[PDB]
């Protein structure tokens, strides 16, 4: 069995998607150590009103003040599993809720959402059922590993610039001011843990959150969170159209899932400076392509994701943390499945399995 990904198969009514609820959070510090609190959370702090327009130098500090996380370390779901283990007897939904849920990272769900429209990058998701719960963990494809290692210097600096933009737009305390003189250390991360449900599939997932906005009228997470992005400056209706069709689809999918309502974009010029800022409310992103023959449709994204969750749940029958059903997909073909045991694909660690079993 396989699963088709064409948009035409998923263009029916928008499916049921539960308003996400934040169950908790965790932080990773500068050494990538886990802490079950919000210490890594930063606060939205835009340019002072009535002052100069934004003019952020995204190249400042590159590479001397850049401390990149080590990508050769495969973390898989480990940090989320630690959170689950530490909150297993405190989850909502009553007895057995976790046993009927699917657990994964927000980014993995985002890749599913954008699959019907993706033309460049394929993916692989390892799936294991354990105590009823279905766990989904991404596996690096051969192309992704090759690309990673051969990452152009331009692309490495572009990644830095995205994190640097966050530094210019956030303060360490509510109402504080940004401090661009510090290090951009990408081991640091703040993650929200959320409960949702797509169709008849309950979900427990976590996603990195860029900042909390103290100026937002809605103070309850995730309503108060803001996602921070950069993109090249655009000048023609054509450039804007391409951005609406391709980039906004990715921003929408990523923020829609956890219920983050606003994405603030810093548009950067060729010289590396952000000279304009614009808010894109997540719930209004689709409007830009609603009457576009070459646009994307949130319903297609969500109906495909629901179909994949049904396909994975029906395919992974065996409850065994050491067994993996690997779902693989490349543009142009369907999602295919292969079955494997133990290394290298098995991803649920003994420290988690043993504790949950006892
Ligand atoms: C090697 N590889 C396979 N997948 C995935 O596993 C599924 C089932 O195939 P499989 O290789 O598990 O089983 P067979 O059909 O028996 O293999 P067969 O092709 O008949 O080859 C016979 C034996 O030689 C191995 N093999 C063949 N060619 C290569 C190779 O170029 N590199 C490596 N590492 N192993 C190879 C293969 O793993 C198997 O043990 C594939 O559809 C992929 O999704 C991989 N995924 C990632 N991310 N990276 C990989 O390098 C990779
Ligand atoms: C991928 N990843 C996540 N963590 C961590 O795991 C937890 C969950 O994160 P998460 O699931 O919230 O991360 P996302 O940014 O949503 O995921 P990502 O796969 O990057 O994005 C999903 C989809 O969104 C797409 N996307 C979102 N925004 C953009 C965009 O601005 N441009 C483009 N081209 N694509 C975008 C992206 O292409 C992809 O298809 C956090 O603690 C993270 O630190 C990772 N840690 C390490 N060491 N290495 C990693 O590659 C890594
Ligand atoms: C900005 N940007 C370019 N690629 C990205 C990716 O893969 N993930 C995230 N979150 N942002 C990206």
Curated annotation (Swiss-Prot):
What protein name applies here?
Answer: Decapping and exoribonuclease protein
Consequence the record notes for mutating residue 208 to A: Abolishes the decapping activity on both incomplete m7G cap and NAD-cap RNAs. Abolishes the 5'-3' exoribonuclease activity
**Pfam families referenced in this protein's UniProt entry, alphabetically:** RAI1 (PF08652)
Record's cofactor remark: Binds 2 magnesium ions.
Q: Which family would the database say this protein is a member of?
A: Belongs to the DXO/Dom3Z family.
Name the residues that bind adenosine 3',5'-bisphosphate.
159, 210, 254
Q: Which GO terms describe its cellular component?
A: nucleus
Which cofactor is recorded for it?
Answer: Mg(2+)
Q: Which residues bind Mg(2+) 2?
A: 166, 208, 210
Q: Where in this protein does the record put region Adenosine 3',5'-bisphosphate?
A: 227-230
Task: Give the function comment from the record.
Answer: Decapping enzyme for NAD-capped RNAs: specifically hydrolyzes the nicotinamide adenine dinucleotide (NAD) cap from a subset of RNAs by removing the entire NAD moiety from the 5'-end of an NAD-capped RNA. The NAD-cap is present at the 5'-end of some RNAs and snoRNAs. In contrast to the canonical 5'-end N7 methylguanosine (m7G) cap, the NAD cap promotes mRNA decay. Preferentially acts on NAD-capped transcripts in response to environmental stress.
Any one GO MF term held by the record is:
mRNA binding
UniProt enzyme class? hydrolase
What does the organism's lineage look like at the top? Eukaryota, Metazoa, Chordata, Craniata, Vertebrata
**Residues annotated to bind substrate:** 32, 75, 105-107, 191, 208, 229, 254
Q: Which domain of life is it from?
A: Eukaryota
Q: Does the keyword Hydrolase apply?
A: yes
Instruction: Please give the biological process terms from Gene Ontology that the record holds.
Output: mRNA catabolic process; NAD-cap decapping; nuclear mRNA surveillance; nucleic acid metabolic process; RNA destabilization
Note how its activity is modulated: The 5'-3' exoribonuclease activity is inhibited by adenosine 3',5'-bisphosphate.
- Which keywords appear in this protein's UniProt record, sorted alphabetically? Exonuclease, Hydrolase, Magnesium, Metal-binding, Nuclease, Nucleotide-binding, Nucleus, Phosphoprotein, RNA-binding
Give me the residues that bind Mg(2+) 1, please.
166, 210, 227-228
Gene name of this polypeptide: Dxo
Q: What is its EC number?
A: 3.6.1.-, 3.1.13.-
Its recorded reaction(s) are: a 5'-end triphospho-ribonucleoside in mRNA + H2O = a 5'-end phospho-ribonucleoside in mRNA + diphosphate + H(+); a 5'-end NAD(+)-phospho-ribonucleoside in mRNA + H2O = a 5'-end phospho-ribonucleoside in mRNA + NAD(+) + H(+); a 5'-end NAD(+)-phospho-ribonucleoside in snoRNA + H2O = a 5'-end phospho-ribonucleoside in snoRNA + NAD(+) + H(+); a 5'-end (N(7)-methyl 5'-triphosphoguanosine)-ribonucleoside-ribonucleotide in mRNA + H2O = a (N(7)-methyl 5'-triphosphoguanosine)-nucleoside + a 5'-end phospho-ribonucleoside in mRNA + H(+)
Tell me where it resides.
Answer: Nucleus
